[PDB]
Ligand binder design. Structure first.
Ligand SMILES: Nc1nc2c(ncn2[C@@H]2O[C@H](COP(=O)(O)O[C@H]3[C@@H](O)[C@H](n4ccc(=O)[nH]c4=O)O[C@@H]3CO)[C@H]3CC(O)(O)C[C@H]32)c(=O)[nH]1
Length: 397
């Protein structure tokens, strides 16, 4: 039986059912969430959670806005920080601490990100960090150390591309990959409270990617995830979410490595972009559904739930107690990549938490990155257009 069939039967027999809308489309993340819910539902007498897949994360936020418009919302949903900011304009969210959920021990990197006007409105659940995936076999073949600095990284990609006859640094031309390069060239998105997409560091980061394509060391991936394109052409490296860990492990026909990100200098790893989502609880839920949500959120933050979830997926454990749990410890003792993901989670940056950020990161900035990389648009001209389109949107609403 599929975990979802088990959940269907649990919920059919329950007196109260709290809907949880999510953007996991399959693989380990969907299975780990479903397994967690099956175990929680077994503990409860006539009280259950029903996970409902809404497609991916942007399908989820579109369907959540339409749910408001149709007058009928789930009890819980996954949300990015910028989605929480949007739902707060409508005052749609219950303060988490009012519900009774204890948040002491939640990483302050994650807890700070869910706190708005001093109030926590999300529970960090599935938080990822960017890591360096590499081909251990291909680096060994050419005597190339794992690069520790941006300078070393560019040098390695050129040395390995020339030897193997193809570009070996694989990337999606998207806001997530852009953020890695932007952040570690000294970039910041807010200057004196204003959103700035066309700063010198943004032009420098996009120009670096464009030059990498022209010089033959950077390969744009335009169809599917990087881990869905492995096997065609030489691969050395990618900068990608920790949540891609199980997908790379199943796809790679080589010895997969995971390292901390190249930084400006060897004094510190590079900053990784934090992705994945928080759980939120909707005000429109009944008292009884909100009690299920409270018990569910406390279960999700328990050291065992966090240990099983993060080791099944490559998401970062969100509590200090998860790291003390023997299941976590047994996994980490067999697999150094779990400690590498935790160490990289210490060097973590977020994108702006503006209500408009979902639309800006995909339709405005994402599109300028694609114009520059796929159609050789001038990076400054592409980003100047992105700045005007973003200013017009913010001024709009
Ligand atoms: N809607 C909305 N999206 C946002 C926002 N900020 C960032 N992002 C998106 O979050 C994804 C990162 O989230 P994360 O939980 O770390 O990783 C996801 C998947 O990315 C990754 N995955 C899935 C299948 C696969 O074959 N390989 C694989 O790696 O696994 C996880 C669960 O599906 C990025 C990826 C994107 O969806 O393509 C665009 C980015 C925002 O503000 N709004």
């Amino acid at each position: 039986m599929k975990p979802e069939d088990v959940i269907k039967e649990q919920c059919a027999r329950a007196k109260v059912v709290a809907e949880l809308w999510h953007g996991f489309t399959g693989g380990a993340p969907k299975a780990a969430l479903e397994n967690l819910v099956v175990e929680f539902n077994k503990a409860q007498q006539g009280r259950c959670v029903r996970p409902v897949p809404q497609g991916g994360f942007r399908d989820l936020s579109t369907k959540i806005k339409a749910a408001f418009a149709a007058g009928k919302v789930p009890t819980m949903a996954q949300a990015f920080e910028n989605n929480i900011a949007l739902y707060l304009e409508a005052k749609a969210l219950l303060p988490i601490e009012s519900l009774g959920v204890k948040l002491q021990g939640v990483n302050l990197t994650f807890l700070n990100a869910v706190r708005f006007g001093g109030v926590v409105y999300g529970v960090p659940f599935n938080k990822s960090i960017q890591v360096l995936y590499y081909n251990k076999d291909l680096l060994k073949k050419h005597g190339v150390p794992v690069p520790a600095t941006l300078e070393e990284f560019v040098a390695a990609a050129k040395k390995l591309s020339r030897a193997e006859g193809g570009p070996v640094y694989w990337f999606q031309p998207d806001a997530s990959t852009f953020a890695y390069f932007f952040f570690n060239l000294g970039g910041s998105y807010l200057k004196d409270g204003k959103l700035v997409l066309n700063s010198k560091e943004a032009v420098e980061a996009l120009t670096l990617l464009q030059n990498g394509v022209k010089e033959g060391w950077a390969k744009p991936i335009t169809s599917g995830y990087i881990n869905q394109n492995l096997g065609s052409g030489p691969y050395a490296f990618s900068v990608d979410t920790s949540a891609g860990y199980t997908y790379y492990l199943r796809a790679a026909k080589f010895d997969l490595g995971v390292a901390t990100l190249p930084g400006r200098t060897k004094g510190q790893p590079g900053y990784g972009l934090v992705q994945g989502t928080n759980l939120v609880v909707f005000r429109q839920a009944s008292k009884e559904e909100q009690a299920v949500a409270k018990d569910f959120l406390e279960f999700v933050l328990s050291p065992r739930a966090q240990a099983v979830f993060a080791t099944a997926t490559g998401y970062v454990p969100v509590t200090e107690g998860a790291l003390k749990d023997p299941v976590y410890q047994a996994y980490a003792a067999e697999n150094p990549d779990y400690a590498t993901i935790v160490r990289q989670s210490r060097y973590a940056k977020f994108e702006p938490a503006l209500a408009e950020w979902e639309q800006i990161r995909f339709d405005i900035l994402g599109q300028a990155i694609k114009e520059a990389i796929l159609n050789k648009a001038d990076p400054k001209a592409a980003l100047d257009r992105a700045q005007k389109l973003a200013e017009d949107l913010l001024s709009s609403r």
